[PDB]
Amino acid sequence: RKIIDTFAVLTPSAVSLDMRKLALGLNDDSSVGENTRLKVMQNCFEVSNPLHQLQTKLTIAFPDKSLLQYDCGKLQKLAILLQQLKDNGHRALIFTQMTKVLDVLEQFLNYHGYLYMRLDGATKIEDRQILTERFNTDSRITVFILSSRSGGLGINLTGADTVIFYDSDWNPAMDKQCQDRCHRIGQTRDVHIYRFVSEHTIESNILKKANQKRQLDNVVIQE
Amino acid sequence: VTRTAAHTHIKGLGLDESGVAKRVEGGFVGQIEAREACGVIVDLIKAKKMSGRAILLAGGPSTGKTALALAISQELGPKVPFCPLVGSELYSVEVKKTETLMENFRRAIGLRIKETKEVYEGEVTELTPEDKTISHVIVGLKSAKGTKTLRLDPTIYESIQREKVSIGDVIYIEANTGAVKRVGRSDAYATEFDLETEEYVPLPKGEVHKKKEIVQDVTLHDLDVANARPQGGQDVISMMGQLLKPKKTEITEKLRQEVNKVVAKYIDQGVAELIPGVLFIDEVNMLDIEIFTYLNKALESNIAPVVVLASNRGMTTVRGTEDVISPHGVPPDLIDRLLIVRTLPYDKDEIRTIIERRATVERLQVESSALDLLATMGTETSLRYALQLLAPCGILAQTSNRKEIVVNDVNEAKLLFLDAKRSTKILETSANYL
Amino acid sequence: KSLSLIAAHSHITGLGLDENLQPRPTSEGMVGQLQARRAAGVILKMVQNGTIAGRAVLVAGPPSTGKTALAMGVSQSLGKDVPFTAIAGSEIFSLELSKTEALTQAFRKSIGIKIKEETELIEGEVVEIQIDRSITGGHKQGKLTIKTTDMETIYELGNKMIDGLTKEKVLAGDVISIDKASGKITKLGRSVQCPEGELQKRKTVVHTVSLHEIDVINSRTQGFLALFTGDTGEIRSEVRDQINTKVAEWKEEGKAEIVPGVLFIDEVHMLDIECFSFINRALEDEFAPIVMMATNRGVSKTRGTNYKSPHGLPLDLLDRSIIITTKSYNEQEIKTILSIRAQEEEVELSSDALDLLTKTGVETSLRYSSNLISVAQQIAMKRKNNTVEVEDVKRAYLLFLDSARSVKYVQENESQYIDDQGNVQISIAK
Amino acid sequence: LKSLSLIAAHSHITGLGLDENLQPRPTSEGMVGQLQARRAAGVILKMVQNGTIAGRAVLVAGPPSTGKTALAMGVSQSLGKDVPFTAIAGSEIFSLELSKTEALTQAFRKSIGIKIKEETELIEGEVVEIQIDRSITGGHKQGKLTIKTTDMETIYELGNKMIDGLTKEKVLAGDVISIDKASGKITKLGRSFAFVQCPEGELQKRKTVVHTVSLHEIDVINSRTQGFLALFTGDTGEIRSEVRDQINTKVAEWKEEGKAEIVPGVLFIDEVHMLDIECFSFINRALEDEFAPIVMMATNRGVSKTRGTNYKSPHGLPLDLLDRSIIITTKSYNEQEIKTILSIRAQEEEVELSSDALDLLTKTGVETSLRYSSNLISVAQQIAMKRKNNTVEVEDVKRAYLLFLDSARSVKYVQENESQYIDDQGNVQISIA
Numbered sequence A: 001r002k003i004i005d006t007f008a009v010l011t012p013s014a015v016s017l018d019m020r021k022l023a024l025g026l027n028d029d030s031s032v033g034e035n036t037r038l039k040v041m042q043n044c045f046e047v048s049n050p051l052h053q054l055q056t057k058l059t060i061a062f063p064d065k066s067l068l069q070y071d072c073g074k075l076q077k078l079a080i081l082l083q084q085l086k087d088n089g090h091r092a093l094i095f096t097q098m099t100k101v102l103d104v105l106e107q108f109l110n111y112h113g114y115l116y117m118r119l120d121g122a123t124k125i126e127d128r129q130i131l132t133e134r135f136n137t138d139s140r141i142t143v144f145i146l147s148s149r150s151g152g153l154g155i156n157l158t159g160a161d162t163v164i165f166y167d168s169d170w171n172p173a174m175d176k177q178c179q180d181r182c183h184r185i186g187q188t189r190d191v192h193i194y195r196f197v198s199e200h201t202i203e204s205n206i207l208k209k210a211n212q213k214r215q216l217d218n219v220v221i222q223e
Numbered sequence B: 001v002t003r004t005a006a007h008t009h010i011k012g013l014g015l016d017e018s019g020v021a022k023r024v025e026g027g028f029v030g031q032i033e034a035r036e037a038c039g040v041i042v043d044l045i046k047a048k049k050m051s052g053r054a055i056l057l058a059g060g061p062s063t064g065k066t067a068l069a070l071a072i073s074q075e076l077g078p079k080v081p082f083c084p085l086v087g088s089e090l091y092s093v094e095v096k097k098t099e100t101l102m103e104n105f106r107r108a109i110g111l112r113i114k115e116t117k118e119v120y121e122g123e124v125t126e127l128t129p130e131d132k133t134i135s136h137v138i139v140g141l142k143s144a145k146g147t148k149t150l151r152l153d154p155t156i157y158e159s160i161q162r163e164k165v166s167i168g169d170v171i172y173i174e175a176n177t178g179a180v181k182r183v184g185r186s187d188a189y190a191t192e193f194d195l196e197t198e199e200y201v202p203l204p205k206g207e208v209h210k211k212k213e214i215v216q217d218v219t220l221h222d223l224d225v226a227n228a229r230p231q232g233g234q235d236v237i238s239m240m241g242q243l244l245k246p247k248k249t250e251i252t253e254k255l256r257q258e259v260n261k262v263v264a265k266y267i268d269q270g271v272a273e274l275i276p277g278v279l280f281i282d283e284v285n286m287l288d289i290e291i292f293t294y295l296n297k298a299l300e301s302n303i304a305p306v307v308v309l310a311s312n313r314g315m316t317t318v319r320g321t322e323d324v325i326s327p328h329g330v331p332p333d334l335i336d337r338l339l340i341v342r343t344l345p346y347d348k349d350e351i352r353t354i355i356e357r358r359a360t361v362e363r364l365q366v367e368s369s370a371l372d373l374l375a376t377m378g379t380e381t382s383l384r385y386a387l388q389l390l391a392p393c394g395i396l397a398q399t400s401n402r403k404e405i406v407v408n409d410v411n412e413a414k415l416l417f418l419d420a421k422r423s424t425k426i427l428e429t430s431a432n433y434l
Numbered sequence C: 001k002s003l004s005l006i007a008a009h010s011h012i013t014g015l016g017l018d019e020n021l022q023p024r025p026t027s028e029g030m031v032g033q034l035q036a037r038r039a040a041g042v043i044l045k046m047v048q049n050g051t052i053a054g055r056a057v058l059v060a061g062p063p064s065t066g067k068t069a070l071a072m073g074v075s076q077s078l079g080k081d082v083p084f085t086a087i088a089g090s091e092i093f094s095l096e097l098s099k100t101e102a103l104t105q106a107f108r109k110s111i112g113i114k115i116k117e118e119t120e121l122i123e124g125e126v127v128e129i130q131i132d133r134s135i136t137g138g139h140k141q142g143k144l145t146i147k148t149t150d151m152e153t154i155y156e157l158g159n160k161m162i163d164g165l166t167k168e169k170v171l172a173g174d175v176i177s178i179d180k181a182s183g184k185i186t187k188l189g190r191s192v193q194c195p196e197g198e199l200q201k202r203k204t205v206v207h208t209v210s211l212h213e214i215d216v217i218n219s220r221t222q223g224f225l226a227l228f229t230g231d232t233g234e235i236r237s238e239v240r241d242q243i244n245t246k247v248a249e250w251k252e253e254g255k256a257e258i259v260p261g262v263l264f265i266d267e268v269h270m271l272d273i274e275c276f277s278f279i280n281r282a283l284e285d286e287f288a289p290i291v292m293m294a295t296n297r298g299v300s301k302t303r304g305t306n307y308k309s310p311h312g313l314p315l316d317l318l319d320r321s322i323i324i325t326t327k328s329y330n331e332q333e334i335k336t337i338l339s340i341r342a343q344e345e346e347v348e349l350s351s352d353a354l355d356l357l358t359k360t361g362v363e364t365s366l367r368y369s370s371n372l373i374s375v376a377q378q379i380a381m382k383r384k385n386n387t388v389e390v391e392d393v394k395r396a397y398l399l400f401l402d403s404a405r406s407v408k409y410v411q412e413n414e415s416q417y418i419d420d421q422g423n424v425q426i427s428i429a430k
Numbered sequence D: 001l002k003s004l005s006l007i008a009a010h011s012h013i014t015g016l017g018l019d020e021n022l023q024p025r026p027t028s029e030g031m032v033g034q035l036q037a038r039r040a041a042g043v044i045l046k047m048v049q050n051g052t053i054a055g056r057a058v059l060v061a062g063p064p065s066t067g068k069t070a071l072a073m074g075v076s077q078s079l080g081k082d083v084p085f086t087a088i089a090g091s092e093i094f095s096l097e098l099s100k101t102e103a104l105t106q107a108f109r110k111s112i113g114i115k116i117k118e119e120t121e122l123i124e125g126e127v128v129e130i131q132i133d134r135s136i137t138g139g140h141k142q143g144k145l146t147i148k149t150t151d152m153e154t155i156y157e158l159g160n161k162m163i164d165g166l167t168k169e170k171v172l173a174g175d176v177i178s179i180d181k182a183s184g185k186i187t188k189l190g191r192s193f194a195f196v197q198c199p200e201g202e203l204q205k206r207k208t209v210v211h212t213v214s215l216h217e218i219d220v221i222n223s224r225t226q227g228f229l230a231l232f233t234g235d236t237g238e239i240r241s242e243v244r245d246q247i248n249t250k251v252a253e254w255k256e257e258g259k260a261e262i263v264p265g266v267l268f269i270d271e272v273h274m275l276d277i278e279c280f281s282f283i284n285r286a287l288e289d290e291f292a293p294i295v296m297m298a299t300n301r302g303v304s305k306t307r308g309t310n311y312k313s314p315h316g317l318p319l320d321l322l323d324r325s326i327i328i329t330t331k332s333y334n335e336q337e338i339k340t341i342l343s344i345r346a347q348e349e350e351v352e353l354s355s356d357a358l359d360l361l362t363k364t365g366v367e368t369s370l371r372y373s374s375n376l377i378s379v380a381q382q383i384a385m386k387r388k389n390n391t392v393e394v395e396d397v398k399r400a401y402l403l404f405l406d407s408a409r410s411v412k413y414v415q416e417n418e419s420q421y422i423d424d425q426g427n428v429q430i431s432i433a
């Protein structure tokens, strides 16, 4: 069932409906009688077949749980560096901009099976300090998910050693604060800060136009 | 990383807007007439009006006929359907070669359609008859943003009984097709049991009823197989309809008349657009005389598009005939409706640019002395022997830890590997059939 | 709206003959071949007469003469309601089907049967619908009102009228047209509809069905599935004999009238001798359609025997058949054919390009010029003008080579091309 | 371990036996001699182990008793696991239900495999007690049991399918289970005290599973549902090429997404001389495809007439096949190498031989053939075994020589007795006078 469920992809994209009824002769009007189709449809209705997995797998192409990381260019090398930081014994922070990547990142982190805690504007005030002290103390939580405006401005997280940026709109002072939440007084290990920039996109033009202009301020991205 | 097998160095013909072909452009050196004339064939397929035109490519080995076939197949683009085919492949024992030949003529053509379908999804609340019955089931799908109840056919209800769903399971139901997929138990019942084989999926966001439009392309031969035999279904009558007679048969002309009748009705509604394609037949000299004589009437037919042939012979005997001697292995009536594009050979410097550009695509570094030696082997043994020996020189460079191809590596390739004429010269001297 | 792109046989529409059967020089796409078009008009009035049967005709000639185009003109001038079967000579060779029974299948496919009957129809606008059923029992009781310009009445409905009325959605504004014998409903328009006339009218319906369809239908029940899927073959002849007596009884009773169709076989030269003797018997049957043959080859050896029979056919076939021959064309008729192909392809040509295209059409062939007229408009189209110049015809001549020129190139380059014994010089030196 | 291995002609050859500089040793890994053939075969071995190139055909030719099939056996043995190797015959493609071209395409799809990996969770621990709860009339079972290990001991409540698999398959408190969450099936591995079980480690662990599947299997599976029954019963054939084209774009998309990695396998065809010209031109096209494995051919015949044509083409193959292929040739062996091969066949067959029996067996191996001596070494230990000693004497080799006759000796006996044997025209003298 696993090889069938994983290796059956293609679908017969062209079909004619109501041809299955006519090929056997059982329809609303035919040369056969009235309860031939009824007794045949009932004896068919009782008899089962073990090929229903291949039938349902071949009728509709199943968009299974694996395509969360394969449809995203940023999620291709993200799990590789999370495995590399897992094997080296490091903790990481993730800072995003909008909340629509937070639930997708929660489904990805639940897919790869780590221990995480999310902090954003949808949480309460009571769970915030307990979720802060849970990550600051020695635990098994590797990744701690935050946001830019809510939890990446004034907290004192000294546990993590890695900052991961998915997207950065404003970076003369604003994105510097998010990576400065990690680097604090209570850190004795060096901070490795990564950044996710795509290829031949707008984000590829932002840092390329900012490298020549020494990264003062961006106005209009046009290329 | 990147697999290169006698191809992938050609990104098309590489012609200008005026028509004049460059000397070095797009993995091609020389061959101006076949590339520019091949671009005239490319525009001829881009006309979407011509049909019945047959242009064979005749030449010797290592001259660039199949490379020109990948040049026109790459110059047309993915939107134009390309059907690679060999004349040795048309022999079949299930049906005749006529059905495979005319069927391939229906395989070359394409037709893109646009259609909208309805999408229903939600958590199953009640499975109950209406109030009185003949056994139908109202399925109350609880989505996130809405709650709606719908009445279904007994066949899709039978597939619902097949999926073993219950109260509180997220399903996926398509309106026009009737296929049923289960996503899993909803997240509200995750705390009912501590361990369960059924995975827990969240509730689907959005409405209950959803619509979208697809620009899906599907070939006309795929519509012919869809008009010929039953493919599959989820019921017993459809699966036994498949299992009873799945052996493919010949197709009558009236079936194609109804297929292109409703296809012509779809192009009268403005929904679809008819685009011709390319059937490329390899090794036409291997064809029988029956396929040639059906190609005579088949090129007189209407839907036969621009077909490109490739024959590598001359005044030889046709297969299936005893005394008939004709050029290219093609009968003179089929050769009269054919168009011949003569292929030009290559000099020593052009062999040097073939080995050079093939070496740059192969990402190997060749020194100038080994480049001139591979040029002399290109002008002594063959082109395919030098292109065949590009890789073992880099292998011996890897074993000798060198990054460039040297004289001793290609001479060691001359000692470890022999060409045609050394093999014949060795096999001329025999003690007991050497 | 028969599907019509640009074919080689698209411009020929009808035979183009007068009432005295003398053909015009330019008429209905066919120019030249006066005797072939006149004799083909004799075949046309032979099918239109229908009093005789069991006759075979043959159209022969050299290539680029249009014997297939002449039979296309006969099939186009034949009109509708008459069956025309155009099969290939190598089409009868099959593995699941025998060649003789497939030839008998074509001989049954050529002739059709017209059967007519009368049915009643009630078409009128719906005012309101008032059905009546029960929450537990069933037994629906339908009532609705049908209205037209001069009639407005309430019709009570039965069980099957509410079965078809509830399996197919309909409204008060929606307008139906009901057949009494068929029992199915035609929901035509809603309040398209704008109807006139009487409410209940009776009209006649006519159906055309060939004898092959009745043969596979009366073979077995799954012969209808074999009629669509094509998995038929080797029918018992008791269906053919009792179907022949049943068709003759339908002709004697006046119920069913038949239409004598035409059977056209393309490339009849490479046919088996068993099919030859089978035609030699089957031409003498009662229900035997007019057969037109196009022998395309020359004098050679017939398939199935060792001797070289003349014409590629045995003399038993050619004894009971008539033969029409075609001749070559003049220089002016090639220019006229290229002019009417310019009118069919919607291509505007110049005078000098038509003269040079006529000269290279005389020198090489008709088909090469008939494709150079197509590509010349596109070499002209790359220069962004619709006018075709002589430079486009010269470029299209030097690019697209003739068969005899590359025969000279093959004979000059025989070391390059592979020989009969498989020897080939794939190198340059030594 | 435990691939089924009796004494074969190709059993002693285990690996190619080459050094890091690809120069072959005289005696290494069962292969003695043929330095250029083993070095070039090592170039093919690192060509498969490189995997950056494809669409290449090679040919191994030579006289009989040279071991070109043994050289390809050494390449397949030095190839190792996880790489598919397809060894088919030249006359195997001729079938009545299957066309020869589509069977050759089936072999070309059988040669290349795909590795796909995923991660699953597993809970393994000792059971303390089981306490299910159902009803005598209603149903709706409610299971509870306790799972214990060295550092964890907890009670797990069960669902409906856990009691379905827990009652379909008999289990006890003493019996120990290992449950996968995604699969839902139970592994009753061991039992406690009167089994194996003695477990360590954590309770719930996640491990990765890797599956290897060739492209031909995906081709017949994506053909239809009963293509799996045709995958086991072998009633497949003549698949539509839309499965091959959309499967090629799907495999290329899986390579672009990084989900599925493929392994370039080797296609070996034995006795390729008697092949049809349609398969020859089909190889001439199919060698230029993108997903084209490395093809090794062993042309075994001589110069003769090709099947399907009338002319005598050289090599038994057309030049279009031999133009795009590389050719390795083998030579005859010396007198010492036959004694070395018979010595390593004595080591493979576990046969103790004397020096004089090895010298006379080497002489009759030089005179007649390699195979006759390679069977006389087998029967000589049994003529020795009838004398109840393991030592092989020269009398056993002489008796095995006078009993088992060579082909040329009975050719002389046939030519001396042509009146006894039946002639070409069926004439035979079955009488004496």
Ligand SMILES: Nc1ncnc2c1ncn2[C@@H]1O[C@H](COP(=O)(O)OP(=O)(O)O)[C@@H](O)[C@H]1O
Binding pocket: B006, B007, B027, B028, B029, B030, B031, B059, B060, B061, B062, B063, B064, B065, B066, B067, B068, B312, B354
């Ligand atoms: N003009 C050219 N430029 C570059 N490479 C060429 C050219 N002509 C031929 N080749 C190379 O020669 C190889 C074999 O030629 P091929 O097309 O197989 O010849 P044929 O069509 O006669 O069999 C191809 O891989 C192609 O890359």
Ligand SMILES: Nc1ncnc2c1ncn2[C@@H]1O[C@H](COP(=O)(O)OP(=O)(O)O)[C@@H](O)[C@H]1O
Binding pocket: B300, C008, C009, C029, C030, C031, C032, C033, C061, C062, C063, C064, C065, C066, C067, C068, C069, C296, C337, C366, C370
């Ligand atoms: N009388 C005619 N009028 C118009 N076109 C003709 C005529 N005769 C021949 N042709 C041309 O000849 C071509 C086809 O010749 P065809 O019928 O195939 O010859 P054959 O039957 O001998 O092979 C068509 O493109 C058609 O335009």
Ligand SMILES: Nc1ncnc2c1ncn2[C@@H]1O[C@H](COP(=O)(O)OP(=O)(O)O)[C@@H](O)[C@H]1O
Binding pocket: D009, D010, D013, D030, D031, D032, D033, D034, D063, D064, D065, D066, D067, D068, D069, D070, D300, D341, D370, D374
């Ligand atoms: N290099 C070698 N090392 C050991 N044994 C060999 C070697 N070459 C050939 N042989 C022997 O040759 C036999 C195989 O011969 P084979 O290759 O079948 O002959 P052919 O080439 O005529 O098919 C095997 O029994 C094997 O022991």
Ligand SMILES: [Mg+2]
Binding pocket: A154
């Ligand atoms: Mg502060």
Ligand SMILES: [Mg+2]
Binding pocket: B065, B066, B282, B310
């Ligand atoms: Mg080729």
Ligand SMILES: [Mg+2]
Binding pocket: C068, C267, C294, C296
């Ligand atoms: Mg003709």
Ligand SMILES: [Mg+2]
Binding pocket: C280, C281
């Ligand atoms: Mg007679």
Ligand SMILES: [Mg+2]
Binding pocket: D069, D271, D298, D300
């Ligand atoms: Mg062998």
